[PDB]
Amino acid sequence: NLYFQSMSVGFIGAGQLAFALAKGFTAAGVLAAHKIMASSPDMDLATVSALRKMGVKLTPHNKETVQHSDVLFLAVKPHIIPFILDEIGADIEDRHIVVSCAAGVTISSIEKKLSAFRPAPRVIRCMTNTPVVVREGATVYATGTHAQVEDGRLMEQLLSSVGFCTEVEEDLIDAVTGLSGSGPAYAFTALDALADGGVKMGLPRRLAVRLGAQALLGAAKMLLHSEQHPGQLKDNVSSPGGATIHALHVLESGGFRSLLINAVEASCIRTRELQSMADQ
Amino acid sequence: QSMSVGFIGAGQLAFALAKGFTAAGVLAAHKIMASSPDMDLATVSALRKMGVKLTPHNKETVQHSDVLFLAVKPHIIPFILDEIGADIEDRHIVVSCAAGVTISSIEKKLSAFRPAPRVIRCMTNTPVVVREGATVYATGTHAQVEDGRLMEQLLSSVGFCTEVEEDLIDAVTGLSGSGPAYAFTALDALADGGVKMGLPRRLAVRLGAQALLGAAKMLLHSEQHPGQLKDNVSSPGGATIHALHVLESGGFRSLLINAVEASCIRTRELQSMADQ
Amino acid sequence: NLYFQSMSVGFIGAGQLAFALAKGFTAAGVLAAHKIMASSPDMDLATVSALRKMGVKLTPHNKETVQHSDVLFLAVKPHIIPFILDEIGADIEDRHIVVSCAAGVTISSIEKKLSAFRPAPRVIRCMTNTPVVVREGATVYATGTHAQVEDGRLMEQLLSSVGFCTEVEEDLIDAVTGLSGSGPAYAFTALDALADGGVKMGLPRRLAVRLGAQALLGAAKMLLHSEQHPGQLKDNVSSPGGATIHALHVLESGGFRSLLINAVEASCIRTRELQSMADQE
Amino acid sequence: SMSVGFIGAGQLAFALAKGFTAAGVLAAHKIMASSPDMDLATVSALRKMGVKLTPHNKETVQHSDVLFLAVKPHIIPFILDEIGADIEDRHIVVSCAAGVTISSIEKKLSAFRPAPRVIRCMTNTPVVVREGATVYATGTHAQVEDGRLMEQLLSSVGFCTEVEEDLIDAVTGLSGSGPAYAFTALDALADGGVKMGLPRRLAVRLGAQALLGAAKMLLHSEQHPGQLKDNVSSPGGATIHALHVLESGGFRSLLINAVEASCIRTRELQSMADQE
Ligand SMILES: NC(=O)C1=CN([C@@H]2O[C@H](COP(=O)(O)OP(=O)(O)OC[C@H]3O[C@@H](n4cnc5c(N)ncnc54)[C@H](O)[C@@H]3O)[C@@H](O)[C@H]2O)C=CC1
Ligand SMILES: NC(=O)C1=CN([C@@H]2O[C@H](COP(=O)(O)OP(=O)(O)OC[C@H]3O[C@@H](n4cnc5c(N)ncnc54)[C@H](O)[C@@H]3O)[C@@H](O)[C@H]2O)C=CC1
Ligand SMILES: NC(=O)C1=CN([C@@H]2O[C@H](COP(=O)(O)OP(=O)(O)OC[C@H]3O[C@@H](n4cnc5c(N)ncnc54)[C@H](O)[C@@H]3O)[C@@H](O)[C@H]2O)C=CC1
Numbered sequence A: 001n002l003y004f005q006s007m008s009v010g011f012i013g014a015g016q017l018a019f020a021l022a023k024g025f026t027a028a029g030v031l032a033a034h035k036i037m038a039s040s041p042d043m044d045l046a047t048v049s050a051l052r053k054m055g056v057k058l059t060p061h062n063k064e065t066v067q068h069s070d071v072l073f074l075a076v077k078p079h080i081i082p083f084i085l086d087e088i089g090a091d092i093e094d095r096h097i098v099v100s101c102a103a104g105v106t107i108s109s110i111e112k113k114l115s116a117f118r119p120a121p122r123v124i125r126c127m128t129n130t131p132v133v134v135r136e137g138a139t140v141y142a143t144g145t146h147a148q149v150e151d152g153r154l155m156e157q158l159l160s161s162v163g164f165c166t167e168v169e170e171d172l173i174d175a176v177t178g179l180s181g182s183g184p185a186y187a188f189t190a191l192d193a194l195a196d197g198g199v200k201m202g203l204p205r206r207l208a209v210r211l212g213a214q215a216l217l218g219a220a221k222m223l224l225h226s227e228q229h230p231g232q233l234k235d236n237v238s239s240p241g242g243a244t245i246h247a248l249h250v251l252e253s254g255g256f257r258s259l260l261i262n263a264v265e266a267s268c269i270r271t272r273e274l275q276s277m278a279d280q
Numbered sequence B: 001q002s003m004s005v006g007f008i009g010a011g012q013l014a015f016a017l018a019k020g021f022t023a024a025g026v027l028a029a030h031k032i033m034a035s036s037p038d039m040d041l042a043t044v045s046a047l048r049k050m051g052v053k054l055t056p057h058n059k060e061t062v063q064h065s066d067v068l069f070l071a072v073k074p075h076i077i078p079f080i081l082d083e084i085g086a087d088i089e090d091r092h093i094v095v096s097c098a099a100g101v102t103i104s105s106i107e108k109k110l111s112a113f114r115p116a117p118r119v120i121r122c123m124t125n126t127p128v129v130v131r132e133g134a135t136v137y138a139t140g141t142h143a144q145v146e147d148g149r150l151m152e153q154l155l156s157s158v159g160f161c162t163e164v165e166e167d168l169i170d171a172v173t174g175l176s177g178s179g180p181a182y183a184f185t186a187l188d189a190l191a192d193g194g195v196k197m198g199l200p201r202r203l204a205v206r207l208g209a210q211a212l213l214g215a216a217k218m219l220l221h222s223e224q225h226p227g228q229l230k231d232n233v234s235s236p237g238g239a240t241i242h243a244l245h246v247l248e249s250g251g252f253r254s255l256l257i258n259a260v261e262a263s264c265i266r267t268r269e270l271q272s273m274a275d276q
Numbered sequence C: 001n002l003y004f005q006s007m008s009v010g011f012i013g014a015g016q017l018a019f020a021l022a023k024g025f026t027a028a029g030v031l032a033a034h035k036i037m038a039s040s041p042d043m044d045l046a047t048v049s050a051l052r053k054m055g056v057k058l059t060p061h062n063k064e065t066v067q068h069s070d071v072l073f074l075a076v077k078p079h080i081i082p083f084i085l086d087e088i089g090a091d092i093e094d095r096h097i098v099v100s101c102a103a104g105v106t107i108s109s110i111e112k113k114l115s116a117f118r119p120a121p122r123v124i125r126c127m128t129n130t131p132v133v134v135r136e137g138a139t140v141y142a143t144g145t146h147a148q149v150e151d152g153r154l155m156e157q158l159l160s161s162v163g164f165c166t167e168v169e170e171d172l173i174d175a176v177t178g179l180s181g182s183g184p185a186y187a188f189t190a191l192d193a194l195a196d197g198g199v200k201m202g203l204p205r206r207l208a209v210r211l212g213a214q215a216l217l218g219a220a221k222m223l224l225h226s227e228q229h230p231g232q233l234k235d236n237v238s239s240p241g242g243a244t245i246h247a248l249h250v251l252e253s254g255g256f257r258s259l260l261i262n263a264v265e266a267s268c269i270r271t272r273e274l275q276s277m278a279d280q281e
Numbered sequence D: 001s002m003s004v005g006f007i008g009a010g011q012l013a014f015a016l017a018k019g020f021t022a023a024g025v026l027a028a029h030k031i032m033a034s035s036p037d038m039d040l041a042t043v044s045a046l047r048k049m050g051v052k053l054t055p056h057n058k059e060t061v062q063h064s065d066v067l068f069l070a071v072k073p074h075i076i077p078f079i080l081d082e083i084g085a086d087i088e089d090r091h092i093v094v095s096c097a098a099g100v101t102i103s104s105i106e107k108k109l110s111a112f113r114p115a116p117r118v119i120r121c122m123t124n125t126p127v128v129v130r131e132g133a134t135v136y137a138t139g140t141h142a143q144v145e146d147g148r149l150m151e152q153l154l155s156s157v158g159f160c161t162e163v164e165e166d167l168i169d170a171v172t173g174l175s176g177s178g179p180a181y182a183f184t185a186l187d188a189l190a191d192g193g194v195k196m197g198l199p200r201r202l203a204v205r206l207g208a209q210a211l212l213g214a215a216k217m218l219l220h221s222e223q224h225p226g227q228l229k230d231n232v233s234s235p236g237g238a239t240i241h242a243l244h245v246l247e248s249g250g251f252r253s254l255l256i257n258a259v260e261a262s263c264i265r266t267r268e269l270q271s272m273a274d275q276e
């Protein structure tokens, strides 16, 4: 907690991720809102005003964010990262930890940009997801060439306050992007559809959404707290001849499992593809 | 609390509820009794390790408790009601957890023995074991108003709980009753996808489960429609919208509708066989 | 109360789009038909005779359109654009605003052709759709290298009189083409099929067509005027256990959503593919 | 001067009341709506509009000259039993309920007074923006002036025409359910825009504008929708490529399936009701 005593955090970009992390960080009480600064060229988005009401300092100028922050989150779309790196590269100092949240963007490409300005930029690449907004995020991070050993420890302590966090090799991160980065969108789709199923069978929509979301939350918590395999927990629910095993059969007949595999694969591949376009 | 709880049936649900109740601190384990004809099942051993009183005699459980949970398989319910119908006192609240079984069929059995049985019907799910269950309940003909309030206070300690009209319960069964099994299937598949793309299985399972937990929590804590939360994730041209497309191309949404429908219909069908 | 009293408009091309815009502008009262000129090598066209009955001036000679006009719409098929630019490039004056409506054709390619004749051509690229003919179009536009700020404001005023209009970065226009440019065709296909459904269930075809079109119009208007997500508006229609949620299930079972995604993607990709062939040439 | 009542204070009552007041045909405070659940969001919107709210259906009847039945179809018989003795010769009774026949309504009401004036209608939520699609059929005792009055009233919030009653279940499957098909389609078109690089807000706006413009074009054209489609697609172009992938998925057949499924379910529900 001495890490966060006087630490200042900044976000280049003031959109969904910046709000989600800033909301989670302040809710966890690890950072006061006034120690957080965000910059965006369009202060007309719904997220810029939400950060304002939160007590986060805003500015149009990315150089202002760099001069204020000790830990600097890059929270812009991936194709903007090289433009921002050209713009504020001469402003990065030895004190800075540069934490890239951008999907696909490699540590190598960031270090190559910044190293033209100062020889030893401290860079950390991260992949998280929007549920950090409720402190139930899923975060992985990889440390760059010049990151100090306390840099990774500090980063893990920070991202652990808003969910699961663990260090990985960088070559896992595109796959993590396809699973837990895109994950929430798959769950929101499933919950919308489960609610439609409830409505089709006679439930009011508000109740069907509440029950479906509670069912998913509880099942996920069960798995996280169990040493048993997912299939064994499935078997615990399914009584012989009963309703659940009948419903599992219709999922299997539609290739339900294969669709989710397809989704992780497609997101991972698109992530890889976007970065190959970027480097080329 | 001076409250004594009993379980007829000492299987998965009895363990999940007793584990949840005691973890919530609303019941002491020694004030709980559970009965089963096979005193050597694994759930029986798990209940015993928790401190629960176990016995093979369903009459013992009835005489022990004030709130009596029926946690046997649905086809066993009529057998149980004939066995212990003569032992039901004015003090008892009988809470049937059995899928499909109607309040009418329970009240009909018990009323041959003593008028005005106090009956509650509930549908819950296994995540009460981690205090994140989803529970609905319907009050019977002779349940008093405080009976419903007491059961909601009790079941709210282990998850979401709300009162419903009984004719919603077979549909709830198909959604949140069977729901966890849909989620375990999806988590297994998502982890397979992670492994295909290079992740160790243990990490893929942890991330998939955490993603689903976080997304469910976001929706429960947001006023927004799940479609809008979906919109907020997917950036234009990005990985997430590409993945959502392959889900749509397979009819993902329709499979989940199919599942809730099939579970509900099977629940209705099974009770129609019981009535005949 | 808008009126461009000093603006002369010309169309290179006198086909479906020129008619739809000329009809929309004149109905909007922002231009008098006799201040519009259109050219085409085929005066034996249904659209040419329609433009004539509005009062639009017609000529077979593209140079005459250029000499008459201030704002010059390029309303020919995309592969004709380079030929057109070679033909009248020497006739472009300082006063001209060249507005290309051609699918896929880049500002860069237009400016490169015209700059060989006179530096600083003022070019605007737009993508619109046929419902401008009923003043409910969906239009986006992007300003070129030498377009002045008043040129884009003026074009947004003009094009806002026949529907929605906003400025975009040019790299969005091929995707807009696939959504709102091709979109009316998706809708006409859907309405034909919904009417077939009405007829199967016992409705006369005329009534089925009227009701299906009115349902789509009303729903689109509800979404445009609502702050709610399309999914929430969908939830408000369906009664539990009811007819609508039964019908939504059969759409989902066929991958209905995926087909519309497929369509937008296919139109955008084809639009990009065609321009790549043009610029290889 | 006309006083209007709604039995039921949900989505349809709100949409109609918002449309009528936006059209200037009724004062909000000349509308009264009743519901037992005075805690719905629709009830709060109605109260903010200035509509009179009461839990008592009898009060709505006594207030109204024109009385809309806006409860769920399975509620109509209980409603008719409850306030049948309160329907007067002056009332026009307009049922909006999906599937429910004039014959079933007249049978209940005629046990009280001999000649109840009944009109059946099917409409849709876009009356809220005064672009509804409405049909109606006149009952046995409805006067010629009653049909003209209802057409005038419902034409203030969209298209309105008289039909024979045997068309109304089919209308329900087309324009009654229709807006939901369009909302699903608009959500998916926006995902398509986002997949190809557009911001979600812009994609939603463009998709909705394209659909609105195209429907207006057809309503204002004598040409067949296939001919309007032909006018968009140039040879070898983007639009005809996209039309091909729609055809390859059976896009047309899915919309036929939807109209049929909604119509069949509407008939199936009413067969269940009249069986009871
Ligand atoms: N939303 C999500 O689900 C997650 C997103 N991410 C990553 O975070 C990054 C942003 O994601 P979102 O926040 O969803 O994007 P977003 O589009 O919601 O916000 C992006 C922000 O960048 C700002 N911006 C644009 N140009 C800028 C510039 N030149 N200088 C400074 N700010 C500028 C925009 O104004 C906007 O505020 C992406 O790289 C994405 O991969 C990672 C994890 C989850
Ligand atoms: N496990 C679940 O996912 C949920 C189960 N339920 C309902 O709870 C009931 C049981 O569910 P599970 O516990 O999964 O079944 P289970 O089979 O794990 O437990 C069944 C128990 O009943 C006992 N039993 C059999 N005959 C008996 C008798 N004559 N007297 C006393 N005990 C007897 C068995 O020995 C066993 O301990 C079913 O009606 C089910 O629908 C409801 C919600 C969730
Ligand atoms: N119709 C639509 O749905 C929309 C069309 N557009 C664009 O507008 C342009 C034209 O579209 P349509 O009007 O549908 O084509 P169209 O084929 O109806 O009319 C094209 C016109 O170009 C004329 N033409 C051919 N060679 C010419 C030349 N050398 N000089 C002058 N005129 C010549 C033809 O005689 C015809 O009048 C295309 O680039 C298309 O992408 C853009 C948005 C919507």
Ligand SMILES: NC(=O)C1=CN([C@@H]2O[C@H](COP(=O)(O)OP(=O)(O)OC[C@H]3O[C@@H](n4cnc5c(N)ncnc54)[C@H](O)[C@@H]3O)[C@@H](O)[C@H]2O)C=CC1
Binding pocket: C236, C237, C238, C239, D007, D008, D009, D010, D011, D012, D013, D034, D035, D036, D037, D040, D042, D057, D069, D070, D071, D072, D073, D075, D079, D096, D097, D098, D122, D123, D124, D125, D176
């Ligand atoms: N929502 C739509 O898209 C359209 C609905 N309809 C028809 O309108 C009727 C209702 O539709 P929604 O308003 O969507 O239902 P809704 O469920 O939103 O509201 C129904 C209202 O009935 C009230 N209600 C329940 N029991 C009652 C009773 N005994 N006395 C008085 N009110 C009672 C409920 O509290 C609620 O306010 C249905 O028959 C439906 O078929 C027809 C055309 C379009």
Ligand SMILES: O=C(O)C1SCCCS1
Binding pocket: A237, A238, A239, A242, A243, A244, A245, B099, B124, B173, B177, B178
């Ligand atoms: O195992 C089954 O099939 C039944 S058990 C009670 C809730 C879920 S359905």
Ligand SMILES: O=C(O)C1SCCCS1
Binding pocket: C103, C128, C129, C177, C181, C182, D232, D233, D234, D236, D237, D238, D239, D240
């Ligand atoms: O018809 C096509 O293929 C082109 S022109 C119509 C709108 C944009 S795409």
